[PDB]
């Protein structure tokens with residue numbers, strides 16, 4: 033993809049879904065995705 037970034041399209045506190053299929057920008061205090069409802073997890077690469 034364009035714009036080679038080592039970081040994602042998100043900051044330190046705010047996170048994105050553990051899976052790259054979604055990658056939803058979650059609120060912050062989200063123990064589950066805002067789109068999926070999947071639990072805040074580490075996730076593989």
Ligand SMILES: [Zn+2]
Pocket residue numbers: 049054055056065066067068069070
């Ligand atoms: Zn998600």
